[PDB]
Amino acid sequence: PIADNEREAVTLLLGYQLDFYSGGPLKALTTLVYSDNLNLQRSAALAFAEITEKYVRQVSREVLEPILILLQSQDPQIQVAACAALGNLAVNNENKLLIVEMGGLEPLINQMMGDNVEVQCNAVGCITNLATRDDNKHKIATSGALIPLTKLAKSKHIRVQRNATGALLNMTHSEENRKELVNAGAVPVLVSLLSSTDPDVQYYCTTALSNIAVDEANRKKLAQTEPRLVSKLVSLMDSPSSRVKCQATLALRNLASDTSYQLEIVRAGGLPHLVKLIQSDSIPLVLASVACIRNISIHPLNEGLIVDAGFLKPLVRLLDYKDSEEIQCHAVSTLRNLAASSEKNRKEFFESGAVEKCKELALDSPVSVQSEISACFAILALADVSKLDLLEANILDALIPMTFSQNQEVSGNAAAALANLCSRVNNYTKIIEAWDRPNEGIRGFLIRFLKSDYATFEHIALWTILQLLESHNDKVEDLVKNDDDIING
Amino acid sequence: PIADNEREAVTLLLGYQLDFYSGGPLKALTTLVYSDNLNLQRSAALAFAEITEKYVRQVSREVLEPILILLQSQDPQIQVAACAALGNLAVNNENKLLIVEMGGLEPLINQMMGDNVEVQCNAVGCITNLATRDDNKHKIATSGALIPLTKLAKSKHIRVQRNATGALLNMTHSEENRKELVNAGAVPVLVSLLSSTDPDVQYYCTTALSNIAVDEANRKKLAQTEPRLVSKLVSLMDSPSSRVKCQATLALRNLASDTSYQLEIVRAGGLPHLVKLIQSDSIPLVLASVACIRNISIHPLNEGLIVDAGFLKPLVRLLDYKDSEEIQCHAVSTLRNLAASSEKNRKEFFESGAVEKCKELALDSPVSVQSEISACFAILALADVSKLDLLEANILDALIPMTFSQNQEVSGNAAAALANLCSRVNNYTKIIEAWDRPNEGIRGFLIRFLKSDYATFEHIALWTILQLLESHNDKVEDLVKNDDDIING
Amino acid sequence: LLHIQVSPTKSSNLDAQVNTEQAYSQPFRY
Amino acid sequence: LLHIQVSPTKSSNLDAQVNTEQAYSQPFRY
């Protein structure tokens, strides 16, 4: 009797009745609407608001047109109820599109510009919901709603503020719409609302400004008109709200795309905040902050200040984040940005443990991380004063097998590093040891790169052979007398 | 762990309301109704009808008031929709009461008296549903609704007929309401509708008449005024519908409370139908039919006709229905009603195996069945012609232990039968051999009943001893000479 | 006295019984 | 001829990222 399993599996699903968007009920409300009698229309509006409040689905033209018609009313009750109904229906994705196609934006804008704060709230909110569909965003942005949205973002009523700033946020997702926002004058408002004591408003405005900072032109504009923006974001890095912390950090990263902001964030005291955030052991916070410091470390004038601030060891520790490839990449990239600085910073770099950790990661990490590490080694090897030390950390053990990689960032930078390590060093012991190992070591490298199609690789091989000859060493001169090496020409 | 089954177990059952019976929606429909505009009201009524069609619950006065107002419309379609709503709501038991208390019966009666057939249909149906609550039955019965219900039962439209006859049926569950029904003139209509070709109508009418026939005065009325009744019910005993079969049989059984109907049912050809029915595969049909023939067998003039129809052996076989005490009881009772007939019927009775089966059942059945069997034996024993035969079936093996029963029907009738068997028989062999056994035999019986406080029992014992001595036998006289008998005798 | 009898020759008739099953309306059209 | 370098001294700046999280309205009072 397996059947009685099935017998109750069906009844169950026959369960999985409150639908009134058609037939009798709908016709009754519609009849109330087209009566053009004020009281009856009030009744219809209240009914619609309640119904949409309790249940929402994709509805047809005949549901939305009586509501749109109710939105032409001068009566506050009708207005607020109809706006509530349309706003509720605008939670469904097909409804958003249909509502905008029917010309709902014009009545909504009109209702926004009236002196009724509840109607303001509901109309703005309806627009907020409409703007969560990509198709609608540009149409809303160019419809004229931006001026009243910007104005209403300054409302003393927190619900109106949330809806307004939310809509503004919903139109920072494309370059064009962001341009529309900046042209409508939203930026001073957003910046001012960075100080808001409401978590939602603060988050919306922080995120909105962060998205606005994605565009170079907006960054330039902000640099000219909003001089205290960096300070405010910096102070927002210490917000008790985690998402506001994270987003403020992201905004600072985005801004740090530019040189001037790279200097300005440091000048405004952002470094200790970043130092703390990069050690939070919260993946979002760490990601944001390591990205930010990655951008900031590009400016030479910051290097010293970054090392004094104590970034090196936190950065090095980030390399143990084996389940976050991006964090590893950014950490290593920042380290490499700190790898060709002054002597003090160099000593600090070597005292951080970056070389050893990078060596450890070089042969057991994603190819992106490998690439960053390889580049880091390549730049580190440029300093003569460091070469021996790099050699005594046995990084040749990493470099040599990396010259086998089909990723040319890896292999190319490994070749560069190795080559430079072979040049003008006082002691060639480590090089002699690594002549045949690992994996044919340095001689094998020389062979393979001597027969390379890519003229740069071949140039590298020839150049490092020359550097090996150039140095006054008796034995490496003995080791180059092997026939696979020489007749290459 | 453990919890994570419970953790799911809760959620699903949190799975397994935006109605229109309150707030906004209700206020909208209500605004439509009190608008006093016919078209608007029409929309409201349609809405109500659909809503109640999709979902029904206990509702308040504010739901029923506008619906009741819509019941008084000049537009028949408004009335139909509104009454559909009301009728749907009247499926809920508290709604029935509230609707009657608010005075819905007056508009409903008015609707029944109109000329629109859909209006009639829905109004009557609504009253049918209202009359499924006992509180309401007497109120509807005395409201005046009975006269129009009676008229509408004669409608050429089948849905109307079903609703009307159903309401009438709902009026037959108390003596008072049945009296009201008869006074309204419903009986000729119901009887005529026994010939209806619609299963529902004929079931409702058969049941209604069956219930009407529960009262003596009504049976006499029917016997005076409705001469076609028995013929119709008899023909209905062959209906392809089993519920119609069964109810027809039950109606005939109720009618058979009176002697005249006991004769009439036989005269109309009901006996072969009852023969078939007591041998049905369905236990209800058997019960109804055996009860019916039990009532019919009470009239002496029927006895022969009952035997000729072939009842004896099926009746005997009914005794093996060990799981139905009631069926056994009226089978044995019918048999007893056939136990003092003419000589032909007596001979037929003894060839049916009734005696042997009863003897078998006498010590292995419920005390009710025992009572009936004991009586049957007591009546059988009255015929001199039978006595020896009854003794040859070793009836004393049943009779003697039955005289120990605390049930005085059992013991009293067993005593009577024994007493008669000891009287004026030509052969006293079986008496003599049962003198000491089983269960202390006739001797023990005589002693015990001689000591009885009940003068009837003592009378039986003394009379029996007298019959034993008066009858001329050498060894029975020898057996009576014992101390225990004479001392208390 | 020729015979002993303590029960009536015939059994009594059963009392008529009521069917209390309730009828409900047909589907309401509108 | 003094050193070999096939990568830029500094690494590239990251592209600014957009947060695509969408805001929804507050509950609607009427």
What secondary structure does DSSP assign to B430-467, as a single string? Answer: HHHHTSS-STTHHHHHHHHHHH-SSHHHHHHHHHHHHH
Q: Are C8 and B154 in contact (CB under 8 A)?
A: no
| Torsion of Cα atoms, B371 then B376 then B382 then B385, to 10° | -150
Q: Do chains C and D touch (3 or more CB pairs under 8 A)?
A: no
Q: Is the dihedral of CA A86, A87, A88, A93 positive or negative?
A: positive
Cβ burial of B10 (10 Å; 0-12, 13-18, 19+) is exposed
CA B32 to each of CA A37, A79, B70, B75: distance values in angstroms, whole numbers, following the listed order: 11, 20, 11, 15
Q: Is the dihedral of CA A313, A319, A324, A327 positive or negative?
A: positive
Give Cα B314 to chain centroid, integer Å.
21
Retrieve residue A448's tokens. 């393979």
Q: Are A201 and A158 in contact (CB under 8 A)?
A: yes
Contact (CB<8Å) A31/B20:
no
- The C-alpha angle A59, D20, A88, rounded to 5 degrees, equals 25
Retrieve residue B444's tokens. 């023990």
Sole residue written with tokens 């690992």:
A438
Which residues in chain C are closer than 8 Å to B250, comparing Cβ atoms? 17, 19
Q: Are D26 and A121 in contact (CB under 8 A)?
A: yes
Retrieve residue B35's tokens. 């608008």
Find chains touching chain C: ≥3 CB pairs under 8 Å.
B
What is the C-alpha to C-alpha distance for residues B272 and A305, in angstroms, rounded to an integer?
Answer: 117
Find chains touching chain A: ≥3 CB pairs under 8 Å.
B, D
What is the C-alpha to C-alpha distance for residues B115 and B127, in angstroms, rounded to an integer?
Answer: 17
How large is the greatest C-alpha to C-alpha distance in chain B, in angstroms? 109
Question: Which of A29, A36, A77 to mutate to test binding with chain B, by most B CBs within 10 Å of its CB?
Answer: A29
Ramachandran assignment for A154, one of left (phi > 0), alpha (psi -120 to 50 degrees), beta (any other): alpha
Q: Are A67 and A34 in contact (CB under 8 A)?
A: no
- Closest residue of chain C to B206, computed from CA coordinates: C19
CA A69 to each of CA A39, A74, A289, B352: distance values in angstroms, whole numbers, following the listed order: 15, 11, 51, 90
| Phi (first) and psi of residue A35, to 5 degrees | -75, -20
How large is the greatest C-alpha to C-alpha distance in chain A, in angstroms? 108
Which residues in chain C are closer than 8 Å to B454, comparing Cβ atoms? none
Cβ burial of D20 (10 Å; 0-12, 13-18, 19+) is exposed
Q: Which residues of B371-390 are buried (b: 16+ CB within 10 A; e: fewer)?
A: bbbbbbbbbbbbbeebbbeb
* Residue A307, amino acid: V
- Closest residue of chain A to B51, computed from CA coordinates: A25
Helix boundaries (H) for A153-198: 158-170, 175-183, 186-192
Q: Which of B18, B31, B51 sits opposite A32 (nearest CB)?
A: B31
Q: Are B275 and B309 in contact (CB under 8 A)?
A: yes
- Provide the 8-state DSSP code for C11: P
Q: How many CB pairs under 8 A join B and C?
A: 128
Retrieve residue A241's tokens. 């709200």
Q: Are A54 and A86 in contact (CB under 8 A)?
A: no
Contact (CB<8Å) A43/B54:
no
- Taking the alpha carbons at both ends of chain A, their separation in whole angstroms is 87
Cβ burial of A87 (10 Å; 0-12, 13-18, 19+) is buried
CA B71 to each of CA A344, B33, B76, B102, B410: distance values in angstroms, whole numbers, following the listed order: 97, 11, 9, 13, 64
- Provide the 8-state DSSP code for B340: S
CA B353 to each of CA B20, B312, B384, C5: distance values in angstroms, whole numbers, following the listed order: 70, 9, 19, 24
Give Cα B17 to chain centroid, integer Å.
45
- Provide the 8-state DSSP code for C16: P
Q: In 10 A of CB B220, how many CB atoms? A: 12
* Residue A145, amino acid: A
Which residues in chain A are closer than 8 Å to D30, comparing Cβ atoms? 45-46, 49, 80-81, 83-85, 122
Q: Which of C1, C3, C18 sits opposite B214 (nearest CB)?
A: C18
Q: Which residues of A477-488 are buried (b: 16+ CB within 10 A; e: fewer)?
A: eebeeeeeeeee
Residues in CB range of B426: below 8 A, 6 or more apart: B388
- The C-alpha angle B265, B268, B273, rounded to 5 degrees, equals 75
Q: Are B203 and B185 in contact (CB under 8 A)?
A: no
Helix boundaries (H) for A115-258: 117-130, 134-141, 146-152, 158-170, 175-183, 186-192, 199-212, 216-225, 229-236, 242-255
- The C-alpha angle B30, B34, B40, rounded to 5 degrees, equals 80
What is the C-alpha to C-alpha distance for residues B136 and B138, in angstroms, rounded to an integer?
Answer: 6
Q: How many CB pairs under 8 A join A and D?
A: 125
CA B102 to each of CA A123, B12, B420: distance values in angstroms, whole numbers, following the listed order: 44, 42, 70
- Provide the 8-state DSSP code for A407: S
Q: Is residue A12 part of a domain?
A: no
CA A124 to each of CA A328, B5, B78, B477: distance values in angstroms, whole numbers, following the listed order: 43, 44, 42, 121
What is the C-alpha to C-alpha distance for residues B260 and B352, in angstroms, rounded to an integer?
Answer: 29
- In terms of Cα–Cα distance, which of B250, B266, B265 is closest to B213? B250
| Phi (first) and psi of residue A313, to 5 degrees | -70, -40
Q: How many CB pairs under 8 A join A and B?
A: 77
* Residue A445, amino acid: F
Retrieve residue A318's tokens. 């980030």
- Provide the 8-state DSSP code for B92: S
- Provide the 8-state DSSP code for A300: G
SS3 content of chain A, % helix, strand, coil (to 5): 70, 0, 30
Q: Is residue A4 part of a domain?
A: no
Q: Which of A12, A24, A51 sits opposite B18 (nearest CB)?
A: A51
Resolution (A): 2.4
Q: In 10 A of CB A223, how many CB atoms? A: 16
Retrieve residue A481's tokens. 């007398």
- Closest residue of chain B to C18, computed from CA coordinates: B211
Contact (CB<8Å) A46/B27:
yes
Question: Which of B16, B22, B32 to mutate to test binding with chain A, by most A CBs within 10 Å of its CB?
Answer: B32
- In terms of Cα–Cα distance, which of A89, C30, A50 is closest to B27? A50
How large is the greatest C-alpha to C-alpha distance in chain C, in angstroms? 79
What is the C-alpha to C-alpha distance for residues A316 and A349, in angstroms, rounded to an integer?
Answer: 10
Domain range spanning residue A403? 17-489
SS3 content of chain B, % helix, strand, coil (to 5): 75, 0, 25
Contact (CB<8Å) B84/C26:
no
Residues 5-24 of D with CB under 8 A from A: 5-7, 9-11, 13-24
Q: Is residue B8 part of a domain?
A: no
- In terms of Cα–Cα distance, which of B488, B352, B358, B473 is closest to B424? B473
What is the C-alpha to C-alpha distance for residues B213 and B208, in angstroms, rounded to an integer?
Answer: 9
Secondary structure string (H, E, C) spanning A340-397: CCCHHHHHHHHHHCHHHHHHHHCCCCCHHHHHHHHHHHHHHCCCHHHHHHHHHCCCHH
SS3 content of chain D, % helix, strand, coil (to 5): 0, 0, 100
How large is the greatest C-alpha to C-alpha distance in chain D, in angstroms? 78
Cβ burial of A37 (10 Å; 0-12, 13-18, 19+) is middle
Q: Are B218 and B180 in contact (CB under 8 A)?
A: no
Nearest CA-CA distance, residue C8 and chain B, Å: 9
Domain count, chain A: 1
Contact (CB<8Å) B125/C7:
no
Q: In 10 A of CB A474, how many CB atoms? A: 7
Residues in CB range of A270: below 8 A, 6 or more apart: A230, A234, A237, A252, A292, A296
- Provide the 8-state DSSP code for B480: H
Nearest CA-CA distance, residue C24 and chain B, Å: 5
- The helix (run of H) or strand (run of E) holding residue B354 is helix B354-361
Q: Is residue A171 part of a domain?
A: yes
- Closest residue of chain B to C29, computed from CA coordinates: B84
Question: Which of A253, A293, A458, A465 to mutate to test binding with chain D, by most D CBs within 10 Å of its CB?
Answer: A253
- The helix (run of H) or strand (run of E) holding residue B10 is helix B3-15
Sole residue written with tokens 């006709």:
B305
- In terms of Cα–Cα distance, which of A372, A350, A352 is closest to A361? A372
Residues in CB range of B361: below 8 A, 6 or more apart: B319, B328, B369, B373
What is the C-alpha to C-alpha distance for residues B180 and A129, in angstroms, rounded to an integer?
Answer: 66
Retrieve residue A476's tokens. 């490496």
Which residues in chain A are closer than 8 Å to B56, comparing Cβ atoms? none
Which residues in chain B are closer than 8 Å to A15, comparing Cβ atoms? 16
Q: Which of B19, B32, B49 sits opposite A31 (nearest CB)?
A: B32
B157 in C contact zone (CB under 8 Å): no
Q: Is residue A2 part of a domain?
A: no
Retrieve residue A214's tokens. 């994605």
Retrieve residue A327's tokens. 């964090």
Q: Is residue B9 part of a domain?
A: no
Q: Is residue B54 part of a domain?
A: yes
Contact (CB<8Å) B25/A25:
yes
Q: Is residue B5 part of a domain?
A: no
Q: Do chains C and B touch (3 or more CB pairs under 8 A)?
A: yes
Which residues in chain B are closer than 8 Å to C24, comparing Cβ atoms? 91, 128-129, 132, 166
